Structures are given as C-alpha cells and as structure tokens.
Amino acid sequence: MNIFEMLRIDEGLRLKIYKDTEGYYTIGIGHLLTKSPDLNAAKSELDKAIGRNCNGVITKDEAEKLFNQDVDAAVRGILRNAKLKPVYDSLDAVRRCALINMVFQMGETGVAGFTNSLRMLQQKRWDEAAVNLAKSRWYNQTPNRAKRVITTFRTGTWDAYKNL
C-alpha cells in the first residue's frame, strides 16, 4: 500500500462534477474545484485546470493527472510549513502517509491548527494522539475516514486499509 492507493480508497474516483461531503464542487479523486455555489463557476475552474472545454466531465487520465499534482503539492506544502515539517521528519514511512492524507483533505492550514495532536505525534505518544485527534469536527463529520487515518497513526501499519 502507498499514499496513492490510500487516498484513492478514501476519496473515490468520479469523472463528472460532484459535490463533496461538505457540498463543494469536486471532480476526480477528491480535487476541490471551488467553494462557490455556482455550478458555472465550477465548470470554469475545471476547464482552467484541464486546459480544455470539458463541459463538466473528464477522462481517467485527466483525473489521475490532477491527483498526481495534488499529492505532490500536499507533500511540498508539508515540507514548506514550519509547523508541519518537523512532525513529518520525525515520523516513520506509514505514519508520514497518514499526515499527507490529512493535508490533502483539509489543507495545510487546517492540519497546522491541530497543535496538541501534532505535539503528541512528535513525541510518539500514539494512544494519546489518537484520542486527541478524535476530538475534532473532522472526526465528527467524516468518522469512517477519520478512524482509518487515526488507526494508521496509532499503529503505524496499514491494517485499516487492508480490509477495503
């Protein structure tokens, strides 16, 4: 298992514009298009992103391309972030994937907001951090996905995904 397969499980793949759990316009593998309510604003962002007139629909290849960009940008974002970088550097390979997953879902800023949890992960206090991460809107809104990520931080294995 790797970051790509993990995220593909959590986000799914959709070739037509859709609304995410929060009601936002998304496409492909969790690629947010706009927080704007206008389907038209979404279609425009889409065309801008792909470089063609898509009319709200993309191919598998296009979805995967966006996905590669998004994962890359998530990693680079962590590395450039003063709060995130040190945590990432301290983690083992599997746990690093769990942090990337959070950043992909909620943006750098949002994850950087989890001050206490980040501190616990850095200290390698697995059980304590899992308990603290669960006390969040994130967990209450998307509990199955959050649990999977949390188990990953807790155990340092891919068990939560070997099911799926």
How far, in Å, are 51, 67, 80, 110, 140 from residue 60 at the CA level?
15, 10, 30, 29, 31
For residue 117, say whether it is annotated as part of any ligand binding site: yes
Is 11 one of the annotated active-site residues of the chain? yes
Alpha-carbon distance of 119 to 130, in angstroms, equals 12
Residue pair 64/29 in contact (Cβ under 8 Å)? The answer is yes
CB-based burial of residue 23 (10 Å sphere; 0-12 exposed, 13-18 middle, 19+ buried)?
A: exposed
- Residue 108: partners with Cβ closer than 8 Å, 6 or more residues away: 77, 78, 81, 84
Give buried/exposed letters for 65-94 (b at 16+ CB in 10 A, else e): bbbeebbeebbebbeebeebeebbeebeee
Adjacent-strand bridge partners of 14: 28
Q: Give resolution, Å, one decimal.
A: 1.7
Place of tokens 């929060």: 22
CATH classification at residue 103: 1.10.530.40
For residue 90, say whether it is annotated as part of any ligand binding site: no
For residue 104, say whether it is annotated as part of any ligand binding site: yes
CB-based burial of residue 51 (10 Å sphere; 0-12 exposed, 13-18 middle, 19+ buried)?
A: exposed
Looking at the structure of the chain, the number of domains it has is: 1
For residue 53, say whether it is annotated as part of any ligand binding site: no
Element (H, E) at 151: helix 143-155
- The active-site residue out of 20, 47, 64, 128 is 20
CB-based burial of residue 29 (10 Å sphere; 0-12 exposed, 13-18 middle, 19+ buried)?
A: buried
Alpha-carbon distance of 145 to 95, in angstroms, equals 15
Domain span at residue 64 reads 1-164
- Residue 140: partners with Cβ closer than 8 Å, 6 or more residues away: none
Adjacent-strand bridge partners of 26: 18, 32
Is 20 one of the annotated active-site residues of the chain? yes
State the Cα torsion 69-71-73-74 to the nearest 10°. 160
State the Cα torsion 9-91-124-158 to the nearest 10°. 30
Structure determined via: X-ray
Q: Which two tokens stand for residue 63?
A: 């979805």
